[PDB]
Paper text:
Besides mammalian CLRs, bacterial lectins have also been proposed as viable targets for drug development, such as the opportunistic pathogens Burkholderia ambifaria and P. aeruginosa expressing BambL and LecA (PA-IL) / LecB (PA-IIL), respectively.
Here, we identified hydroxamic acids as additional drug-like molecules to target the Ca2+-bearing orthosteric site of LecA. The electron density corresponding to the full structural model for 35 was detected at the carbohydrate-binding sites in subunits A and D of LecA. Comparing the structures of LecA-35 and LecA-galactose complexes illustrated the galactose-mimicking properties of 35. In the LecA-35 complex, two oxygen atoms in the hydroxamic acid functional group coordinate the Ca2+ ion via bidentate chelation, which is also typical for interactions between hydroxamate-based inhibitors and metal ions in metalloenzymes. The two oxygen atoms form hydrogen bonds with N107 and D100, mimicking OH3 and OH4 of galactose. A water molecule (WAT2) is in contact with the nitrogen atom in the hydroxamic acid via a hydrogen bond. WAT2 mimics the role of galactose OH6 by forming hydrogen bonds with the side chains of H50, Q53, the main chain oxygen atom of P51 and water WAT1. Notably, the terminal benzyl ring forms CH-π interactions with P38, an interaction not observed for other LecA-targeting glycomimetics. Moreover, changes in W42 were used to estimate the affinities (Kd) of hydroxamates for LecA, as shown on example of 35 (Kd = 4.6 ± 0.9 mM).
Residue numbers in the entry:
A (entry chain A), B (entry chain B), C (entry chain D), D (entry chain C): 1 to 121
């Protein structure tokens, strides 16, 4: 029920129309190519070779797709989530974000194409 | 309803328990790191810079995840398929395969973790 | 998903654990046999021949299954709802209720078995 | 996936476009009013008070909704089936049928409105 693009250079991330409510089961699929600065591109799992120098999400590689649900901290998405249920006390609008160091989004390029849907529960 | 791994060095691929029937809607999500020979690894979209020297799937990069449905030709999966329906006359077990040149799977390493489910239809 | 029973004699109805949120798609199936007083029994559509003498739901027959979502007005359920979205902006817990005139639940008998699930959206 | 009507007077029943395949989960909801001969009408559970005089389905009341899957024996549907899986070795097109005595469908009237969908598995 949501399809769109998340730009690697967008520090604020892309607000979706999906409101995660308690008990919701969701599926995410992410595709595409992006860079956090170097003259190469990576998919939605990012670059396993790059050290973490203050990423917004310590549980995903630099250049990975991550998300926030309302005011949650960052949650790894990577290539996507299969029939996934959030931790207790997590709810609200899903924001998709490119995993980088705050203040370093200006040299980023490319984007991921993302589908999000609610599953049966 | 199927969860598993597909080994990059398995030329025959991983035959799943999912039988695709006409009208079925499926979702696939793939994650992980694999190599077609080099010391680097790539995610399930593969290596966008490697030329095609006789890949089993010409519509996906070397080192991408692809599939067959029964005895179909290869179909790109990459990071996954969101609520996907097959063409007419495509039916049978889903086989997941690492995209490489026939005869060259021996120097491959790593695997993709894959979830497949049938959706509402 | 929720499975349970609503008694025809319960003016307060049965509060379920299903929270209807905006955009939710739900499926309900209701079965069983109940009476609003007469010696006969009706299924969850109720008695199409009995006049409305002040039913809690004017859009369903006497002895039908109806519901509230949070503090909404009554909504007909009857035998159930197939991949149903609320026509109004309503939200909150689903309460199931037997459709009868307030203060006349004392001569009611029987019950409906009800399954509620959220569908893909 | 399928929405339509089954006439009470149709002895052959109504063939749907739903092919039940092994492993499939289905949901059916049925509504409406029909008769096996009397002036009164009943919902999809039929008439609890009418004796079985050789019904096509001995496990449902006269005037109930029943079905066959391919050439299976009759299976009770009544008001519907919630996330239901068939017994082993039952496969093929779903035919919906009004439960009556063979040869006695000529005096029947009305119809049930029926929705069938495949659920997640
Ligand atoms: O923008 C940054 C810091 C520098 C990234 C970079 C490293 C090597 C070559 C070019 C750029 N992090 O996201
Ligand atoms: O209880 C009522 C009013 C009376 C309905 C009734 C009619 C004939 C025989 C017994 C009861 N409304 O639900
Ligand atoms: Ca950067
Ligand atoms: Ca190789
Ligand atoms: Ca009453
Ligand atoms: Ca008859």
């Amino acid at each position: 029920a949501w399809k769109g693009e998340v730009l690697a250079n967008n520090e604020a991330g892309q607000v979706t129309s999906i409101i995660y409510n308690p008990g919701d089961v969701i599926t995410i699929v992410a595709a595409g190519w992006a860079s956090y600065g170097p003259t190469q591109k990576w998919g939605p799992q990012g670059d396993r070779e790059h050290p973490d120098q203050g990423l917004i999400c310590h549980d995903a590689f630099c250049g990975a797709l991550v998300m926030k649900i309302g005011n949650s901290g960052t949650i790894p998405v990577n290539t996507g989530l299969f029939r996934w249920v959030a931790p207790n006390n997590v709810q609200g609008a899903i924001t998709l974000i490119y995993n980088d160091v705050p203040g370093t989004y200006g040299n980023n390029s490319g984007s991921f194409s993302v589908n999000i849907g609610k599953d049966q529960s």
